[PDB]
Ligand binder design. Structure first.
Ligand SMILES: Nc1nc2c(ncn2[C@@H]2O[C@@H]3COP(=O)(O)O[C@H]4[C@@H](O)[C@H](n5cnc6c(=O)[nH]c(N)nc65)O[C@@H]4COP(=O)(O)O[C@H]3[C@H]2O)c(=O)[nH]1
Ligand SMILES: Nc1nc2c(ncn2[C@@H]2O[C@@H]3COP(=O)(O)O[C@H]4[C@@H](O)[C@H](n5cnc6c(=O)[nH]c(N)nc65)O[C@@H]4COP(=O)(O)O[C@H]3[C@H]2O)c(=O)[nH]1
Ligand SMILES: Nc1nc2c(ncn2[C@@H]2O[C@@H]3COP(=O)(O)O[C@H]4[C@@H](O)[C@H](n5cnc6c(=O)[nH]c(N)nc65)O[C@@H]4COP(=O)(O)O[C@H]3[C@H]2O)c(=O)[nH]1
Ligand SMILES: Nc1nc2c(ncn2[C@@H]2O[C@@H]3COP(=O)(O)O[C@H]4[C@@H](O)[C@H](n5cnc6c(=O)[nH]c(N)nc65)O[C@@H]4COP(=O)(O)O[C@H]3[C@H]2O)c(=O)[nH]1
Ligand SMILES: Nc1nc2c(ncn2[C@@H]2O[C@@H]3COP(=O)(O)O[C@H]4[C@@H](O)[C@H](n5cnc6c(=O)[nH]c(N)nc65)O[C@@H]4COP(=O)(O)O[C@H]3[C@H]2O)c(=O)[nH]1
Ligand SMILES: Nc1nc2c(ncn2[C@@H]2O[C@@H]3COP(=O)(O)O[C@H]4[C@@H](O)[C@H](n5cnc6c(=O)[nH]c(N)nc65)O[C@@H]4COP(=O)(O)O[C@H]3[C@H]2O)c(=O)[nH]1
Ligand SMILES: Nc1nc2c(ncn2[C@@H]2O[C@@H]3COP(=O)(O)O[C@H]4[C@@H](O)[C@H](n5cnc6c(=O)[nH]c(N)nc65)O[C@@H]4COP(=O)(O)O[C@H]3[C@H]2O)c(=O)[nH]1
Ligand SMILES: Nc1nc2c(ncn2[C@@H]2O[C@@H]3COP(=O)(O)O[C@H]4[C@@H](O)[C@H](n5cnc6c(=O)[nH]c(N)nc65)O[C@@H]4COP(=O)(O)O[C@H]3[C@H]2O)c(=O)[nH]1
Ligand SMILES: [Sr+2]
Ligand SMILES: [Sr+2]
Ligand SMILES: [Sr+2]
Ligand SMILES: [Sr+2]
Lengths: 319, 319, 319, 319
């Protein structure tokens, strides 16, 4: 829309303007003959452009152009100064004081509406851009948190915080392809807590969760290369994909981890009283060929996991 | 920033401007003496305000003010017309042709920069508001679909599409409170497919899912009041909360539904060969009192469900 | 699979069994002639059924049946006692000690495998049910938290915690239908912070968010009936759907809220220095008719909101 | 719980059992003297173990042991055969017919309850494991689809399907670290549609979305190595991270893509009538050093993007 605040001592100007603007529904008029209600009414009606007379009843017009740019409730409103006539410093001061125009009362009702229409409309879109900035900041900060949640949750196992299975499955599939392009050594650790049902059954399911937690922490601490990925494979089972790692490297890493767990010395009553939580690990490493399916790597790890288990638990074996 | 395209036949004007603007890094200048590259260069440099001479080498200046407002690649760029001197229709035409100003070459380098600074800056924020409109439309349509997904998924059971359990639990809790304020009759249907393990075992788990589907559809068709809510309570179990429904009303609704299922005549081999899928229903209705826990309503439905089951299945009984 | 631990002093029994079971790949055998490694090997091989001789080299067979049911690492393994011959208390003791069978060495290799096959297979599915219990508990507690997130997030505005817009839109649509069935009075509050751009601009966007927060809290405190719903309508705009509330009731509620906000006395510099954060509210209440679109209620609230605004802000007006 | 179906011709046996089981609330009894309602009642009461007499009123007991294992509604129920006395093939047949025990009517009420308690309880947990299998299959297939949604949605831009910004930001951060370990050449393409506001404004926002779509498709087709990642950087901006790619390689890839877009020959009216949609691209490639921040790579791409733009659009330039 449009709203012009006129401010001028003489009713004869307030009238000319009122008349020029009657045949324009798009734009409304508001006369303010009392320069000591000027900024007040400016705040109240929310004008989109104000017209300011430079000489009034013993109150400097430029003093008011001062306040307009001074009070930030008006700071941004376009100001056309109405003068009689064309004096020097008073046109230069107009602008020094913040005026955006300096007009002689009055051009015809064409340039008058044009000029009004222009400044008004600019202010309007100034309001709009600011409004948009707000709304965008909101939406952007809604997607802000939306992104945290689905991430901490899509790809993370809540209990341990390690990656989850579907992240593992999908991550490992990616790494398989990367590996085959680079003819790189892709290694995989398959990790299981020994005698876990037995732990779960006399300590409690929560106590087992807490146990899983501590083991999950040790896993997270074994690997520390950008592409090392630790995951909860499924329940008591953990995995750990190690791109670019040799069989001997993987095994070394596996043994430091196994020792770590045992070393926490977590009380278990299996296989015998006095026992502490142990962990069996299957190691497996492959350089993928085209056409080869990543499941081969998993199977190899499970062979290793199965071997380690069938040779006394708490040990590492390559499948 | 700021970019002024000057377009004027005389190098002496291109020079004055160039000079006025040298001591201003914020604003860059670009002279275009050839009015037959005017719009071309306008497109190329992306000016934020153009200054147009009205008389040039035998090419109407207002013809170019025409094109500027004509080509939408420039449509929105503020135009200050530079004239010599102040002729009549040529100021009125300035604006009729789209000009936003009409200046006499040249005011001092204060009003010249002021005026330039103003129009430039308005255009700038015109660009910004439009940019924001785009970005907001994107974000808003990201939350658009984001909302569909989590909704079709937070509150809906995928297989049947009925509400899910947590929606049921939470919805029923709400309705319990509404009911106790209104001392209204809150009814609940607890629905189970008879001999479902037996169905699942010789037809297949998928075939059972499809069976669940058809039953889920019938449930959805029994209730049709704004607050009626059908849910998959858990597996072979369905629920259906009926606010504002009498015991006799609930029972009537229960019997139409039970008949419906039986009537689909879905082949089952239990309890005997030749049988068709049946359904047992527990009815229960309560007017909640303060302090009373909604679990009472559920228990009552299960009594009914249990009774119906222990009296030959395929029937409705109030607990 | 199947794994039988035999424990018997005489190699001649260990042999008969070994022989009976050779032609059965499904089932593996393990002889334990030394009753002082019995439970040890039981732990190591994870048998699915153990056969226990009642008399051995000076170590009571029933003492071992004691330990089997004693150590929980074996607690659940089925025990067939092998005796010679059929003595009294020794069959009754067999069971008193935990035995699940009492056989005479030896039935033919049909009943022997049958019996073994049965107990073994039961234990097997005992293991399976327990495994399933674990895995189900996991999945269920994954959907546990999955449900919190999408809920606290699908339907809640993060900043204020009030409902969000899409929840409002959808909730109000539901309540419209409920209302038209009950020919009930549905009221709606449309709430806006007065001079918010002005607040946002000199205090900071965060400070405005914090301002929004405090106002959001007051809203949440105005309504307290099961179906009252407070929402962030969009930015500086809040809504509040009040089912079953009279026009006069809605207005009363509106005025207590408006006073509350003003009373927090939150420093604003608009409309004038020394001002405190105020709020304009639009009230509107409808009894919905069939065919009537809920948008009518919203429009009525906005009329009220618009009126209140155009009469000095910080007030309530019915549209 | 426990439910024994006895089936025997003589009431005197039905009585002994009834009596043995009265002092046991955990277990209920059900006598079936009419062998021609046997399976019928088996279906009706859902027994957890049935006791079967081998000789009855002119109806073979083993015929009924046949049906029990025959009808799958009973298939899994444990069967203790009650005989008088101990005949040969009739114990071997007992098992051949499916019996799980063969008892002489009757042992004392200790072994009788023991034996009953055992088979009953096994069946019970057979039911439980199956129940669990169902419930787990449900939960697992809820996480099934839950995973699709948040994935197709967390990491994918809906409109183009390319990765989104947060995936880009996070993916590129990962690749930066991988790159610095391998001292590998990490390249990045920054892609922008030339004159897009101009396209959006006279064709329509949807038409621009469709335009974005077609361009997004071409991008997706340029890169095809496991680690190449195409993303919508923000609105009209696209990105494309190319691990392990030389500056010259990146540029080659950039030029094939740019040509592709231009070649679709999508009608635009800018910069001039008759124009087709073009695209500007910034190329940049870095071998990351420790301590170096990935933002360097982005800046370099933007320099290139900026250069390309400030040299006529529709071209590739390295920043
Ligand atoms: N013209 C061309 N096409 C490219 C280029 N980069 C990837 N592609 C396209 O994408 C397909 C395979 O991408 P891959 O995942 O890298 O995975 C590759 C990779 O592991 C291996 N491979 C093929 N040739 C080479 C090579 O020259 N160097 C390396 N390091 N690996 C290669 O074989 C697998 C698939 O072979 P493809 O069937 O050839 O099929 C290629 C091809 O159609 C390229 O620089 N030029
Ligand atoms: N995927 C993965 N594998 C791991 C990790 N830590 C050790 N390894 C495996 O075990 C081998 C070396 O372990 P090293 O005793 O730490 O002894 C290391 C160390 O002293 C040095 N080195 C290698 N990279 C780094 C590094 O990024 N930081 C530091 N401080 N030293 C490194 O070189 C020696 C052996 O190099 P490698 O041949 O690379 O071979 C590695 C690798 O295959 C890990 O966090 N993730
Ligand atoms: N001063 C005031 N407070 C209000 C009003 N509406 C709800 N509240 C507040 O919210 C609490 C209970 O809301 P309820 O869920 O409607 O659920 C209500 C409802 O089911 C019932 N109830 C209390 N009085 C009335 C009543 O006069 N009419 C009806 N239809 N129900 C009532 O008792 C339950 C809780 O009683 P309360 O402990 O009293 O506690 C009330 C009270 O502190 C109100 O118009 N005026
Ligand atoms: N929660 C729920 N309950 C249902 C539904 N359909 C039937 N009932 C239950 O069964 C009673 C009447 O069923 P009626 O035979 O359809 O016969 C109806 C019908 O002819 C008329 N009536 C009630 N409301 C409607 C309506 O919304 N549409 C139409 N066409 N008739 C209605 O009044 C008669 C009985 O009114 P009631 O006392 O309300 O009592 C209802 C109610 O307790 C349903 O979709 N949801
Ligand atoms: N035979 C039968 N059908 C039922 C019953 N309850 C709801 N329906 C079905 O669902 C449609 C409208 O449900 P509405 O949302 O309750 O919303 C209702 C409600 O606001 C009003 N309405 C219709 N009759 C009654 C009535 O007898 N009592 C009340 N309190 N409202 C009614 O008109 C709206 C829609 O009218 P409908 O076109 O008739 O169409 C009904 C009808 O086809 C019922 O008890 N019996
Ligand atoms: N949607 C909604 N509306 C609200 C709420 N609080 C007040 N109202 C509105 O304002 C009217 C009464 O406010 P009252 O002064 O609290 O004074 C209340 C109060 O003393 C009593 N009353 C009504 N329900 C409750 C209640 O649930 N708890 C308590 N303690 N008193 C109640 O009855 C008098 C007036 O009853 P009303 O006619 O119901 O009419 C209500 C209602 O239309 C609210 O939390 N939510
Ligand atoms: N003892 C031991 N620790 C390991 C090993 N692998 C990674 N880490 C640990 O994780 C930190 C950095 O992992 P980065 O992301 O691979 O990223 C690495 C990588 O880009 C580079 N870097 C360090 N040494 C080597 C190296 O011997 N070979 C290669 N290819 N890169 C290295 O410097 C960056 C960080 O250096 P750091 O501060 O040393 O710190 C190392 C170290 O504390 C290992 O095999 N042995
Ligand atoms: N990140 C990324 N970069 C790409 C892709 N396609 C081409 N390039 C870039 O451009 C160079 C070669 O493009 P070439 O003409 O396809 O010609 C290729 C091609 O004939 C052969 N080659 C390389 N890998 C493959 C492949 O995976 N499949 C096939 N069929 N040929 C390949 O070797 C020649 C040049 O090898 P380069 O040195 O690797 O260097 C590549 C690389 O830096 C791509 O899909 N992703
Ligand atoms: Sr005057
Ligand atoms: Sr001239
Ligand atoms: Sr012996
Ligand atoms: Sr008999």
């Amino acid at each position: 829309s449009a709203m012009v605040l006129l401010v001028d001592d003489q009713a004869m100007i307030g009238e000319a303007v009122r008349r020029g603007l009657a045949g324009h529904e798009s734009i409304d008029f508001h006369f303010c003959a009392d320069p000591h209600q000027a900024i007040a009414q400016a705040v109240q009606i929310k004008p989109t452009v104000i017209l300011q007379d430079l000489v009034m009843p013993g109150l400097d017009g430029l003093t008011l152009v001062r306040e307009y740019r001074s009070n930030p409730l008006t700071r941004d409103i376009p100001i056309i100064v109405l003068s009689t006539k064309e004096d020097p410093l008073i046109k230069s001061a107009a602008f020094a004081a913040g005026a955006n125009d300096y007009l002689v009362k009055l051009p015809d009702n064409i340039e008058l509406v044009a000029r009004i229409r222009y400044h008004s409309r600019s202010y309007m879109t100034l309001l709009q851009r600011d409004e948009a900035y707000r709304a965008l900041r909101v939406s952007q900060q809604q997607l802000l948190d939306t992104n945290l949640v689905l991430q901490r949750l899509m790809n993370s196992d809540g209990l341990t915080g390690l990656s989850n299975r579907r992240h593992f499955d999908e991550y490992l599939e990616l790494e398989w392809r990367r590996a085959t392009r680079d003819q790189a050594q892709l290694s995989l650790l398959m990790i299981d807590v020994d005698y876990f049902k037995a732990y779960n059954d006399n300590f409690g399911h929560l106590e087992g969760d807490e146990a899983l937690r501590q083991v999950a922490k040790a896993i997270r601490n074994s690997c520390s290369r950008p592409s090392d990925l630790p995951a909860r494979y499924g329940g008591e089972e953990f995995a750990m994909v190690l791109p670019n790692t040799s069989p001997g490297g993987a095994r070394l890493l596996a043994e430091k981890l196994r020792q770590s767990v045992a070393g926490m010395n977590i009380p278990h009553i299996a296989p015998v009283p006095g026992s502490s939580l142990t962990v069996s690990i299957g190691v497996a490493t492959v350089t993928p060929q085209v056409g080869q399916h990543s499941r081969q790597l998993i199977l190899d790890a499970d062979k290793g996991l199965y071997l380690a288990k069938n040779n006394g638990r708490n040990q590492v074996a390559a499948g």
